[PDB]
Design a protein around this ligand. Structure first.
Ligand SMILES: *[C@@H]1O[C@H](CO)[C@@H](O[C@@H]2O[C@H](CO)[C@@H](O[C@@H]3O[C@H](CO)[C@@H](O)[C@H](O[C@H]4O[C@H](CO)[C@@H](O)[C@H](O)[C@@H]4O)[C@@H]3O)[C@H](O)[C@H]2NC(C)=O)[C@H](O)[C@H]1NC(C)=O
Ligand SMILES: OC[C@H]1O[C@@H](O[C@H]2[C@H](O)[C@@H](O)[C@H](O[C@H]3[C@H](O)[C@@H](O)[C@H](O[C@H]4[C@H](O)[C@@H](O)[C@H](O)O[C@@H]4CO)O[C@@H]3CO)O[C@@H]2CO)[C@H](O)[C@@H](O)[C@@H]1O
Ligand SMILES: OC[C@H]1O[C@@H](O[C@H]2[C@H](O)[C@@H](O)[C@H](O)O[C@@H]2CO)[C@H](O)[C@@H](O)[C@@H]1O
Ligand SMILES: *[C@@H]1O[C@H](CO)[C@@H](O)[C@H](O)[C@H]1NC(C)=O
Length: 436
């Protein structure tokens, strides 16, 4: 894709902190950029549509390569069009703004380069307000093994780059992306039946994904997802697997992950409105990526979680599922959880924590997003899922929401002023971001 010129692009600023020891942090002057898929795709010369609703123009985009040459990703009016604002260390993502639904943003090191985090033997903390996230919405904060430059050095027909939010990948090998690896996704494009703005193409973009935070006011989950190749790679067709393919398990990434949602793990009183972590008020989320030998070059061995609210430091609750022990993600926990829930162990098939850790070693990009779910209504996060199962069977119940909740047309109509706000990001050695 070309770099658009119809609407100017300016990246909202966002500060964050690097800590060297508890109480000893310094400020980084970051910025964020909107993902390419949200942008108008304009023909470079006449400023007309290359993509309208969910179909491509056949003159500008007769094939994938020609389309990338003829078409540009426009700049973004962050607040007015996308409902994205920032102030200091805080980033607020609104749900519905006009016809736009949510957003996906990446943290930048500079105007052409995503910030790379090396998570092994490190800790990441942030504050969040999920109080205005009802059933069916997901405010996600997570890491993916994207290329720092958004693909530009590998793919000459990507002239837009990280400056315009190119290069996304995740463990679903997403096929909804309009541009992957310097090519449009027009050959094989199939418009969505249920989303006026989207479709699925032949190309998908795979990479490992560390889902630090997927949450609303009802439930949250923390979930690593390994891939056979840790970093960004193209897939084609149904061999992509993931949520956009016929068989989610047909590809090279684990679409399910090894998840810890305290409600799903048998403690319904821990997280939610008025609960031990009270989602009606902001709180801090700390996540630690421990290695087997406690050094930077060890193998990822354990992912730990603490919350802080009203200055009280509260560890993740223990699993209360028979057969599944502890409050952290480890190989033993993941093996046991899949067995207890009767879920396929795709996590192990794609290399588990060893492959997750290999991705971490390559470096990962911070993503902040707000979305609703045109495949499964977020029921996997906050309801009983699958919806035909007995909700008393271990693994089925994930939150309080009814199984008819989360339909996009319902939540977009009923909760347009919902939002998520992320703030006070801190990153450093273990124990450096909070009072351990
Ligand atoms: C859902 O998860 C939450 C969070 O883990 C869990 O709440 C915890 O419950 C335990 C047990 O009631 C609490 O621990 C007790 O807390 C009191 C007050 O701080 C202490 O006095 C107790 O100390 C005695 O027992 C300890 C062993 O447990 C001994 O080591 C100690 O020497 C004392 O004899 C004990 O620590 C804990 O504080 C809460 N945590 C929070 C944040 O509320 C809850 O029980 C889970 N729910 C279900 C249904 O499983
Ligand atoms: O097409 C130009 C048009 O764009 C409008 O914005 C649309 C995009 O067109 C559309 O591709 C985008 O689709 C979203 C989808 O709604 C989300 O459900 C999905 O969410 C992701 C999430 O971001 C990740 O964090 C999570 O891990 O996975 C889920 C599921 O994939 O993301 C896709 C994009 O990849 O939706 C946009 C918003 O409505 C603009 O509104 C308009 O101005 C433009 O003209
Ligand atoms: O595809 C929806 C959703 O699935 C999540 O994995 C589920 C899985 O689909 C289900 O079979 C299993 O029982 O539970 C896991 C964990 O909820 C995956 O983690 C999500 O990313 C994906 O969005
Ligand atoms: C972090 O602090 C915890 C709690 O005091 C302690 O158990 C742990 O050893 C600390 N980790 C390191 C690497 O110092």
């Amino acid at each position: 894709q070309q770099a658009g010129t119809a609407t100017a692009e300016n990246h909202p600023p966002l500060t964050w902190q690097e800590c060297t020891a508890p109480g000893s942090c310094t400020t980084q002057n970051g910025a964020v950029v909107l993902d390419a898929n949200w942008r108008w795709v304009h023909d470079v010369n006449g400023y007309t549509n290359c993509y309208t609703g969910n179909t491509w123009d056949p003159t500008y985009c007769p094939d994938d390569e020609t389309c990338a040459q003829n078409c540009a990703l426009d700049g973004a009016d962050y607040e007015g069009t996308y409902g994205v604002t920032s102030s200091g260390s805080s980033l607020k993502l609104n749900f519905v703004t006009g016809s736009n639904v949510g957003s996906r943003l990446y943290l930048l090191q500079d105007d052409s380069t995503y910030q790379i985090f090396k998570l092994l033997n490190r800790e990441f903390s942030f504050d969040v307000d999920v109080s205005n996230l009802p059933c069916g919405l997901n405010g996600a904060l997570y890491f993916v093994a994207m290329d720092a430059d958004g693909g530009v050095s590998k793919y000459p027909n990507n002239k837009a780059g990280a400056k315009y939010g190119t290069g996304y990948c995740d463990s679903q090998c997403p096929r909804d992306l309009k541009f992957i690896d310097g090519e449009a996704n027009v050959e094989g494009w199939q418009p969505s039946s249920n989303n006026a703005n989207t479709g699925i193409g032949d190309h998908g973009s795979c990479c490992a994904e560390m889902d630090v935070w997927e949450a609303n006011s009802i439930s949250n989950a923390v979930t690593p997802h390994p891939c056979d190749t840790p970093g960004q790679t193209m897939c084609s067709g149904d061999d992509c697997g993931g949520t956009y393919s016929n068989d989610r398990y047909a590809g090279t990434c684990d679409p399910d992950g090894c998840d810890f949602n305290p409600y799903r793990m048998g403690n319904t009183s821990f997280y939610g409105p008025g609960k031990i972590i009270d989602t009606t008020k902001p709180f801090t989320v700390v996540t630690q990526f421990l290695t087997d030998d406690g050094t930077d070059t060890g193998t990822l061995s354990e992912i730990k979680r603490f919350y802080i609210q009203n200055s009280n430091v509260i560890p993740q609750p223990n699993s209360d599922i028979s057969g599944v022990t502890g409050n952290s993600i480890t190989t033993e926990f993941c093996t046991a959880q899949k067995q207890a829930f009767g879920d396929t162990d795709d996590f192990s098939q794609h290399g588990g924590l060893a492959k997750m850790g290999a991705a971490m070693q390559q470096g990962m990009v911070l993503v902040m997003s707000l979305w609703d779910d045109y495949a499964a209504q977020m029921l996997w996060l906050d309801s009983d899922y699958p919806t035909d199962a007995d909700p008393t069977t271990p693994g089925i119940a994930r939150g309080t929401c009814p199984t008819d909740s989360g339909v996009p047309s319902d939540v977009e109509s009923q909760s347009p002023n919902s939002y998520v706000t992320y703030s006070n990001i801190k990153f450093g050695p273990i124990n450096s971001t909070f009072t351990a």
